[PDB]
A paper describes a structure:
TA_Halhy belongs to the group of fold type IV transaminases and efficiently catalyzes transamination reactions between D-amino acids and α-keto acids; specific activity in the reaction between D-glutamate and pyruvate in 50 mM potassium phosphate buffer (pH 8.0) hits the record high values for TAs: 380 ± 10 μmol/min per mg of protein at 40°C. The structure of this enzyme, dimer being its functional unit, has been identified. Like for the studied fold type IV TAs, the active site of TA_Halhy can be subdivided into two parts (the O- and P-pockets); the amino acid residues of these pockets are involved in substrate binding, thus being responsible for the stereospecificity of catalytic transformation.
3-Aminooxypropionic acid was shown to interact with PLP in the active site of TA_Halhy to form an oxime that mimics the external aldimine of PLP and D-glutamic acid; therefore, successful crystallization and solving the complex’s structure make it possible to identify the functional groups involved in the binding of this specific substrate. The structures of the holoenzyme and complex with the oxime are well-superposed (RMSD for Cα atoms is 0.31). Differences are mostly observed for the positions of loops. In the resulting structure, the carboxyl group of the oxime forms hydrogen bonds with the guanidine groups of Arg28* and Arg179 residues. The Arg90 and Lys241 residues are not involved in the binding of the carboxyl group; the side group positions in all the aforementioned residues remain unchanged.
Numbering used by the authors:
A (entry chain A), B (entry chain A): -1 to 119, 124 to 281
Write the structure that this text describes.
Amino acid sequence: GHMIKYYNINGQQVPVENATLHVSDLSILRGYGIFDYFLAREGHPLFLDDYLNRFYRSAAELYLEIPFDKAELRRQIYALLQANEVREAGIRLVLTGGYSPDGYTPVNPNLLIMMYDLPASSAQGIKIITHPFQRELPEVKTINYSTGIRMLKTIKERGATDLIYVDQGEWIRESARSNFFLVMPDNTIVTADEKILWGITRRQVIDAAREAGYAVEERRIHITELDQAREAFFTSTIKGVMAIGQIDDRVFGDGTIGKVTQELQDLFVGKVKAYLETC
Amino acid sequence: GHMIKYYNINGQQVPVENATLHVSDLSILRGYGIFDYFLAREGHPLFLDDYLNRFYRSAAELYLEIPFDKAELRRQIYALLQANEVREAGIRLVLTGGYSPDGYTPVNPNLLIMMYDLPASSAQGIKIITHPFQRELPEVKTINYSTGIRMLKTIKERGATDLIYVDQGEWIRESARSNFFLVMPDNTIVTADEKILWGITRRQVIDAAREAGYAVEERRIHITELDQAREAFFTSTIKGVMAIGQIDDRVFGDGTIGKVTQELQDLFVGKVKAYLETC
Ligand SMILES: Cc1ncc(COP(=O)(O)O)c(/C=N/OCCC(=O)O)c1O
Ligand SMILES: Cc1ncc(COP(=O)(O)O)c(/C=N/OCCC(=O)O)c1O
Ligand SMILES: [Mg+2]
Ligand SMILES: [Mg+2]
């Protein structure tokens, strides 16, 4: 439906054409900031309390105080959906280190609320590469995506559409923008527990998997366990559950969505529908 | 002298009050960008070709094309000094991933040239802490200073004014904003060779040290070598050569500037004076 006309900067609704920051902002000069991103459906941001809790935790880890309490931020978000006259959207929160006197020391953070159309996003799982790397402050949703973005050319050149980070080439973590899961041939679901972002999609999938009576192991994953797994999938806000058909030279099954991945995809849609019924 | 009135964005001189970027810029959303920083004295950016070469190398590592060749960028810098009617300044170049369609994929970088007053910056060396950490893409002058800025409260609380990163707590690297050197009791100058930014000040000090006939070892430094060293110092654009009086619970000598550090400080001033004589 309606075109996005407005963002919010520091609690003011602004036309998108005037949504700017002065270049003294620490995100621009020092990549200092946190963010979060969630969808809205039926006029409701999904799992909103979980996202806002993460946003507040992220901010506290950078010693950045959000200038509004959580109920006031929720109001600003809802007000922005209404201003843009949309029920279906992507929503980005950004908290920067602010306009710094010396190009380093935070003084006052800048708060952004941006809004987008829902992601527009055959049988085949996506094809990804392993990449040796460990995200900085990985439990914090920082704005730092240098390595993930710098890798886009390498991902493409190599014939893949995404990656999976492996800490020192040994310990499976996450992609730049997704959590990562395996399903073992006995249907055990396996996902990293440490040095990753605790995705909201990850949380909802794990809960749905356990509520369905699946075994879920949150544990260190050795790179060699890719060869014991039957299925692999990503989770994220914009992907939901997304089947991975190939990692490096390994096709998972015939590369089409595995049994448990398909089940979890439906259960995630169910978690979304259940959440919307509470709004 | 004159107040800073103008920055440059994308080759346009703009009043400082109007130096803004739209919030779709990838530095704001994804911390994607590189920068450089150099002083001007007597109307001349110091060691300018060395800084611009690093800027171009940094850009190539993020696959960001600077929209001007080096001679045209040099012109823009000189034009900005003249516009601001200053001979004495700090100068910041920033190249962001640009206004991205999807908040991730670079499309067109934004180029900023910002300008400042010269840094305003008794006997005693500064007091610093070791911190276990390894900078991401350390040879590249990225805008990513999350850990360095997040550590400001910890540095202060602990009674220090800066830090020295130690890779896995074993291998001495650099501070968030300075290269790091030791001087051993036989007057050997020691500095890391790998996984650090190749500072312009570092380069000028090493050359001056070697031209003076000092032994300079560019090599891995074990954390245990702090106890074999007589002197420690930082190098950076804004510090030049700065004596370190204490690291953790270790006072270097009586904490006042060591012999070789003092010599190198004078030689660096000499490299600056020699450079200005060529302009
Ligand atoms: C590093 C990282 N891990 C995991 C995830 C998955 O977290 P949830 O989305 O499930 O909470 C994300 C998601 N970013 O998504 C941000 C929006 C975007 O990438 O366009 C992420 O950035
Ligand atoms: C990570 C890092 N290492 C070493 C240095 C020293 O490099 P040079 O300055 O000698 O080339 C810097 C300097 N930044 O200085 C940037 C300006 C500032 O921090 O305000 C740095 O950021
Ligand atoms: Mg199939
Ligand atoms: Mg003395």
